[PDB]
Amino acid sequence: MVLEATVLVIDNSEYSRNGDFPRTRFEAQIDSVEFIFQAKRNSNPENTVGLISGAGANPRVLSTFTAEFGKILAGLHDTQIEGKLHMATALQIAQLTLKHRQNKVQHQRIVAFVCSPISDSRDELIRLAKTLKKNNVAVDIINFGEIEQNTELLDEFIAAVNNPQEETSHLLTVTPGPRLLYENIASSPIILEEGSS
Amino acid sequence: TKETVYISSIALLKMLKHGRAGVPMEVMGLMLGEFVDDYTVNVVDVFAMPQSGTGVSVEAVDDVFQAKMMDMLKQTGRDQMVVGWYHSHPGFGCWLSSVDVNTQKSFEQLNSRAVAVVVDPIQSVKGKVVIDAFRLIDTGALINNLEPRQTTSNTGLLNKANIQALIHGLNRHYYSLNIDYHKTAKETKMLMNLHYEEKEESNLAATKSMVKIAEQYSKRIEEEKELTEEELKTRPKKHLSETADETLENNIVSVLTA
Amino acid sequence: QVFDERIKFANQLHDEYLVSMRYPEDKKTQQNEK
Amino acid sequence: TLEPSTSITLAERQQLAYDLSISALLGDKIYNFGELLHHPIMETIVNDSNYDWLFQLLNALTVGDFDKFDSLIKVQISKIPILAQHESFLRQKICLMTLIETVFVKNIRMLSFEDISKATHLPKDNVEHLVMRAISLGLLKGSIDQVNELVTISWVQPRIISGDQITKMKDRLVEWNDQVEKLGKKMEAR
Amino acid sequence: SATSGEAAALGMGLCMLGTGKPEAIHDMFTYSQETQHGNITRGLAVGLALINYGRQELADDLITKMLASDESLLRYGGAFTIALAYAGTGNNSAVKRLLHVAVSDSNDDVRRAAVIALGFVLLRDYTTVPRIVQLLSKSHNAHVRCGTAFALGIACA
Amino acid sequence: HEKVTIAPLVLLSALDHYERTQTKENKRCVGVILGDANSSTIRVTNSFALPFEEDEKNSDVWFLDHNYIENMNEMCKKINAKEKLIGWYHSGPKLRASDLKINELFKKYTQNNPLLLIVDVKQQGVGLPTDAYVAIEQEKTFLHLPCTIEAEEAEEIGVEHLLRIRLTNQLKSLKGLQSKLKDVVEYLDKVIHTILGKLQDVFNLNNLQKALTVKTNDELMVIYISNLVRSIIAFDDLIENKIQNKKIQEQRVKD
């Protein structure tokens, strides 16, 4: 629709290598970033997508906002393949990342793919949701594969940041059916209701 | 008329190091800063243009590389626009050639406040930096012909030949200016760090001198013996005084070790 | 201790050398010369 | 490296502690009992079944009773010839370093033969034999004078197990801080 | 706006002549350091000298604060403050302060401001004015030789 | 060991990034340095400034933009091809716990041992506040090297334009003593290892200097002997000037 800044937060933890996708799901997110990159770059004439890995590699940044997909796809193979996922310190990295974008009129949005549930307490997400809500930061949560063995631990994070779909607080639940990876987030209201595909 | 152009202390060492590194090719770089009316030109930070073998021509300015670097400087705390550029002229004085003026005319339509600075990193090694600025015409105080540049004092025209020929008559493409530098109380002590790390280094000269302390004073006394016989055959003092002055300072430092 | 008093005699004569140096030449500038 | 990770269970620590007791008593390299107090070796094991001999090491070296060394290791161990040569090498370092800190006042670390002959209970021939061996290993820079019956010893050993001299050296630094401050103010006026 | 600001700085000084307003001293001095305009900053330094006229030792509070700053324009007006306050009958400590400012400081405009201020403190006797001027007229830094030239034109005229 | 030499262009640049950025609320300004670390004397000919934000209450949250790393590389290679990234500097003397995490960010870009530079913007110390540490294998320890100033006509000349023995050393010795006094007092409050190991070696290596005093005065009087003949020669300079001035007086009277 309009200009926006998209930040993709992947999961490098130990449960990200599971078989939710054929071969290794750790290599599946390579196509997830490519699907969002081709969808957002073709929608607007100027758009950039960032990449932040906060699981097991410490809150580092593989690639920041850029218009080239060469270094983004290459950094996913040599990164840390196993670790512990922490969503409390990972979302704070993308908050300071949005100030480095191209245009200041772009909408602030954070897209995070959560594979396994975090072991940290949910009390930190309460104060974290109120921080992103005051700055009007869109939160996109994709929870898949962790619903079978555990309940969603980010529901309390969404309840505090809860806002109508026209602003922030976008929560998604992917059905564990025999469906392709790029088709799971395609039917979800992510790239839908935009200017062009 | 004379105009005071303020330049930050950080911009001097950057423009000096850039032009001094390469001796030939007459390098170039941009600048950043603000202005106070038309009578004051402030320079805060400077920019470094990429190198080219054309010697500051119309093709040596890359608008693609210029636009990408200024976007990163705004996030580093630089809110100031481009106040002009500086051009090095090794071996010569401060003057503008036919190519430098024609290149300067290309930026008049973009920013009329641009200032072309002529820096000489070669001949500036005497302790007084030789540098001069040349500002374009943004008018607003001028229109056709008027009298800008209040606060007329300090140095004179200088330059070389053609620039000082026409000042008030044609002010458009060239006129003389002056250079001034602004400092603060904190920036003064930043360069004062030249003089317990230095305490240990001070004893290193006296450490190796303890082995030669017999041979160090022997070579000085025997040297004074030959200088003494020089004054006997006169019927000199400068060679004897300079030799003795070096021996007096060496004896006081040795006492400081005790 | 003896070597200290010897150098004091040197700096004393240097200051005494400054006592009368320019004094006899002070009247040369005020008096009109050729 | 065993404590942080890689099988931190006590199964491998019981077999390792048995080797740490043999290497500490026989090994003359690093102190004697000094390293045993740094790592929780005896704290993770029991005090009996031939693990008590580590406690007798500190009491035999500090006191020096001959009956302690004979009962410190029985025949099931001491039959190894390595201990026969190192029997006198264990008490040579502790008895020597104890006399160094005792004689030290200000500038004098010097020792005599009678002071060492009382601690080690050996004649003057064995004094220069055992001390020189520890000096050649780099533990001491000093030497021994056989003629005048004087032993000069420099400062090499870092002398671990601190806390006695921390309060003493704190006032010594104040003395250095005062002398420099007093002489520093005199150089400003004159 | 520095276009009309140059006149406002010199205008308020003539109103503060003599005793003047005590609150006007701290307001014009603090605003001068926060002003980025060149003509306004140099104008307020001259205005501060016009505030204290004939104060003599009563102006030592403003004289100390102006000479303590490292700015170039603030040290320029500090020499004129001593000239107007000590004008007519002067003090032996007023000339001593003007001599140290024109030596240690490397600013050519501040050095010439201290040597020209000597004519106002010597207005009591015009005979001894050239005695000091002849010593300062042979020095280097021709900017100083200009300020010493008017020292005979301020007093002996 | 090695040595660290930094031109005043880099020292003044790191000190001017605090006021321009307007950093407040007790934060830090991180920037990158360029030079050649391959030789025994590290020379830093260039420096830059990068945006850095880290939480004070949480040391596990840090962010650094890598675009400035790739942008300055493409910018320098088009100007100075002899400059590469040798490390980075900080805004303050006090070391934080994030020095090990920042060292992992530049280990891929730097082709040599990353150089840790420490610059004090407050300048509350004596002499040169700038410190230079080298991170080596300990996990990791920081070895400090002496920092100097580069002598060249491309830097120090501009310093002379802007600006224009033992007494200072004794004041520097007091700074090192006060650091050890506060370290012992604060250690006792936290209780009732590397410092205590090197502390006892200082006392045993100025009560010990009194043993060589008998041999110290051997070379002390030689200074006075050298000063005795030094003062005598000084008379030949002053007396000759008196004879020269005496001849000038005879020339003015006869004229």
What's the burial of F88, exposed, middle or buried (CB within 10 Å: 0-12/13-18/19+)? buried
Query: Contact at 8 Å (CB) between A146 and A175?
Result: no
Torsion of CA F181, F183, F184, F189, to 10 degrees: 130
- HSE-CB at D160 with a 13 A cutoff on CA atoms is 12
Query: Contact at 8 Å (CB) between F89 and F119?
Result: yes
Please state, in angstroms and rounded to a whole number, the distance separating the CA atoms of residues D100 and E116.
78
Strand, coil or helix: what is B85?
strand
Q: Considering only CA atoms, which of E23, E72, E20 is closest in space to residue E45?
A: E72
Residue type, B117: V
Strand, coil or helix: what is A153?
coil
CA F157 to chain B, closest CA, distance in angstroms equals 6
In Å, what is the CA distance from F149 to each residue of B70, D58, F38, F116, F130?
31, 54, 18, 17, 11
Please state, in angstroms and rounded to a whole number, the distance separating the CA atoms of residues A146 and A154.
11
What are residue A9's DSSP bridge partners?
A52, A112
Greatest Cα pair distance in chain B: 80
What's the burial of E145, exposed, middle or buried (CB within 10 Å: 0-12/13-18/19+)? middle
- The b/e string for B166-195 (b: 16+ C-beta within 10 A; e otherwise) is eeeeebebbbbbbbeeebeeebeebbebee
Strand, coil or helix: what is F234?
helix
In Å, what is the CA distance from B112 to each residue of A126, B83, B137, B227, F27?
54, 9, 6, 68, 39
Residue type, F37: A
Tokens describing residue F224: 């006075």
Query: Contact at 8 Å (CB) between B164 and B176?
Result: yes
User: Annotated binding site: which residue ranges of B?
Assistant: 87, 89, 100
Would you mind telling me the total number of residues written for chain C in this entry? 34
- Beta strands A170-173 and A138-143 are parallel
Q: Considering only CA atoms, which of E30, E39, E33 is closest in space to residue E10?
A: E39
Please name the helix (run of DSSP H) or strand (run of DSSP E) that holds residue C19, with its range, or none.
helix C2-19
CA geometry: angle F233, F237, F243, nearest 5 deg: 130
Quick one: DSSP state of residue F122?
S
Residue type, A92: Q
Strand, coil or helix: what is E42?
helix
Please state, in angstroms and rounded to a whole number, the distance separating the CA atoms of residues D175 and E11.
64
Q: Which residues of E touch B150 (CB under 8 A)?
A: 39
Please state, in angstroms and rounded to a whole number, the distance separating the CA atoms of residues D174 and D38.
31
CA C33 to chain F, closest CA, distance in angstroms equals 8
CA A91 to chain F, closest CA, distance in angstroms equals 10
CA geometry: angle F70, F71, F76, nearest 5 deg: 100
Tokens describing residue B210: 């303890």
Query: Contact at 8 Å (CB) between A38 and A186?
Result: no
Tokens describing residue A144: 């898949």
Please state, in angstroms and rounded to a whole number, the distance separating the CA atoms of residues F12 and F7.
9
Cβ contacts of A85 within 8 Å, gap of 6 or more: A11, A12, A13, A15, A16, A54, A55, A56, A114, A115, A116, A117, A118
Q: Which residues of F touch B240 (CB under 8 A)?
A: 233, 236-237
Residue type, D188: E
Cβ contacts of B48 within 8 Å, gap of 6 or more: B14, B18, B29, B30, F75, F79
Tokens describing residue A25: 């799901």
CATH topology of domain F1-164: Cytidine Deaminase; domain 2 (3.40.140)
Return the residue in F187, F191, F196 with the most chain D beta carbons within 10 A, the one to mutate for interface testing: F196
Residue type, C14: H
Q: Cβ separation of A96 and F64 shorter than 8 Å?
A: no
Please state, in angstroms and rounded to a whole number, the distance separating the CA atoms of residues F127 and F121.
13
Cβ contacts of D27 within 8 Å, gap of 6 or more: none
What are residue F137's DSSP bridge partners?
F140
CA A89 to chain F, closest CA, distance in angstroms equals 6
Please state, in angstroms and rounded to a whole number, the distance separating the CA atoms of residues A143 and A123.
19
Please state, in angstroms and rounded to a whole number, the distance separating the CA atoms of residues F44 and F84.
10
Cβ contacts of A189 within 8 Å, gap of 6 or more: A165, A170, A172
User: Annotated binding site for Zn(2+): which residue ranges of B?
Assistant: 87, 89, 100
Look-up of token digits 């302790």: B127
Helices of type H across chain E: 5-15, 23-33, 38-51, 60-68, 74-85, 92-104, 108-116, 118-121, 129-136, 142-154
From the CB coordinates, do chains A and E have 3 or more pairs under 8 Å? no
- HSE-CB at E138 with a 13 A cutoff on CA atoms is 5
Look-up of token digits 């008096």: C31
Q: What is the DSSP string of E125-137?
A: -SSSHHHHHHHHT
Residue D141 forms contact with F (CB below 8 Å): no
Query: Contact at 8 Å (CB) between B87 and B100?
Result: yes
Please state, in angstroms and rounded to a whole number, the distance separating the CA atoms of residues F237 and F244.
10
Greatest Cα pair distance in chain F: 92
Q: Cβ separation of E38 and B183 shorter than 8 Å?
A: no
Using CB atoms, pick whichever of A66, A89, A96 lies closest to residue F60: A89
What's the burial of F113, exposed, middle or buried (CB within 10 Å: 0-12/13-18/19+)? middle
Please state, in angstroms and rounded to a whole number, the distance separating the CA atoms of residues D159 and D161.
7
Residue type, D86: H
Which method, experimentally, gave rise to this model? cryo-EM
Q: Cβ separation of F167 and D188 shorter than 8 Å?
A: yes
Look-up of token digits 């996708």: A21
Please state, in angstroms and rounded to a whole number, the distance separating the CA atoms of residues F70 and B72.
12
Return the residue in B43, B44, B69, B190 with the most chain F beta carbons within 10 A, the one to mutate for interface testing: B190
Tokens describing residue D149: 């019956």
Greatest Cα pair distance in chain A: 42
Please state, in angstroms and rounded to a whole number, the distance separating the CA atoms of residues D156 and D142.
9
Encode D142-188 in three state secondary structure.
CEEECCCCEEECCCCCCCCCCCCCHHHHHHHHHHHHHHHHHHHHHHH
Q: Considering only CA atoms, which of D52, D90, D92, D86 is closest in space to residue D72?
A: D52
What are residue F62's DSSP bridge partners?
F54
Please name the helix (run of DSSP H) or strand (run of DSSP E) that holds residue B31, with its range, or none.
strand B28-31
Q: What is the DSSP string of F165-203?
A: -HHHHHHHHHHHHHHHHHHHHHHHHHH--HHHHHHHHHH
Quick one: DSSP state of residue B86?
E
Would you mind telling me the total number of residues written for chain A in this entry? 197
Residue B256 forms contact with F (CB below 8 Å): yes
Rounded to 10 deg, the angle between the E23-33 and E38-51 helix axes is 160
Query: Contact at 8 Å (CB) between D188 and F167?
Result: yes
- Beta strands F31-36 and D150-152 are unpaired
Tokens describing residue D161: 């197990």
Tokens describing residue B138: 């943004």
CA A19 to chain centre: 20
Tokens describing residue B112: 């009329």
Please state, in angstroms and rounded to a whole number, the distance separating the CA atoms of residues B91 and B99.
18
Closest chain C residue by Cα to residue F251 = C28
Please name the helix (run of DSSP H) or strand (run of DSSP E) that holds residue D24, with its range, or none.
helix D11-26
Query: Contact at 8 Å (CB) between E102 and E139?
Result: no
Please state, in angstroms and rounded to a whole number, the distance separating the CA atoms of residues B6 and B183.
10
Tokens describing residue E124: 């009591």
Please state, in angstroms and rounded to a whole number, the distance separating the CA atoms of residues A47 and A146.
31
Other Cβ atoms within 10 Å of E52 Cβ, number:
25
Strand, coil or helix: what is B151?
coil
